[PDB]
Design an enzyme around this catalytic site. Structure first.
Site, mmCIF file in Angstrom:
data_model
loop_
_atom_site.group_PDB
_atom_site.id
_atom_site.type_symbol
_atom_site.label_atom_id
_atom_site.label_comp_id
_atom_site.label_asym_id
_atom_site.label_seq_id
_atom_site.Cartn_x
_atom_site.Cartn_y
_atom_site.Cartn_z
ATOM 1 N N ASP A 58 41.811 83.861 52.985
ATOM 2 C CA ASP A 58 41.195 82.628 52.488
ATOM 3 C C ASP A 58 39.739 82.536 52.942
ATOM 4 O OD1 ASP A 58 43.833 81.771 51.547
ATOM 5 O OD2 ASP A 58 43.993 80.384 53.175
ATOM 6 N N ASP A 98 45.191 73.956 37.860
ATOM 7 C CA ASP A 98 46.336 74.841 37.728
ATOM 8 C C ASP A 98 47.721 74.243 37.526
ATOM 9 O OD1 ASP A 98 47.350 77.555 37.859
ATOM 10 O OD2 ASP A 98 48.049 76.985 39.879
ATOM 11 N N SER A 113 46.753 88.599 51.815
ATOM 12 C CA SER A 113 45.552 88.009 51.264
ATOM 13 C C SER A 113 44.764 87.263 52.354
ATOM 14 C CB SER A 113 45.862 87.015 50.131
ATOM 15 O OG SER A 113 46.553 85.881 50.595
#
EC number: 3.2.1.17
Length: 129
Positions: free
Chosen positions: A52, A101, A50
């Site tokens: 950022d 979250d 991934s």
């Protein structure tokens, strides 16, 4: 866009990040400084494939779509490229979802290691009020 320190403080306050989920503006400025050095265009790839994005280095594994992170989520329901704009609205709307979250600002690695526990109001010192 490279934000000045007080210029970003101004922006984040106006978008409502001051005391959002109990975190003072100083927390959020501190995280932006060590995540992106106040540069909206900052990008960097993580070990798991991934990436950022932006002023608060929002992860493509869970929060935005960049089309090259297998297995991923796009929980902020946004293109990851929209987190690189000079207008931070989308990065702030998405950070509000991330701090909520469950682990608060610990979601930002750099906040936990370089900001948590420190005099984070130093980061809004002299900023116009």
């Amino acid at each position: 866009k490279v934000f000045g320190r007080c210029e970003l403080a101004a922006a984040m306050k106006r978008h409502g990040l001051d005391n959002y989920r109990g975190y003072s503006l100083g927390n959020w400025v501190c995280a932006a400084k060590f995540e992106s050095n106040f540069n909206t265009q900052a990008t960097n790839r993580n070990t798991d494939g991934s990436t950022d994005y932006g002023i608060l280095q929002i992860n493509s594994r869970w929060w935005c779509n960049d089309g090259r992170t297998p297995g991923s989520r796009n929980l902020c329901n946004i293109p990851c490229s929209a987190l690189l704009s000079s207008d931070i609205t989308a990065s702030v709307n998405c950070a509000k979802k991330i701090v909520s979250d469950g682990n608060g600002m610990n979601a930002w690695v750099a906040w936990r290691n370089r900001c948590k526990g420190t005099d984070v109001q130093a980061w809004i010192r002299g900023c116009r009020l």
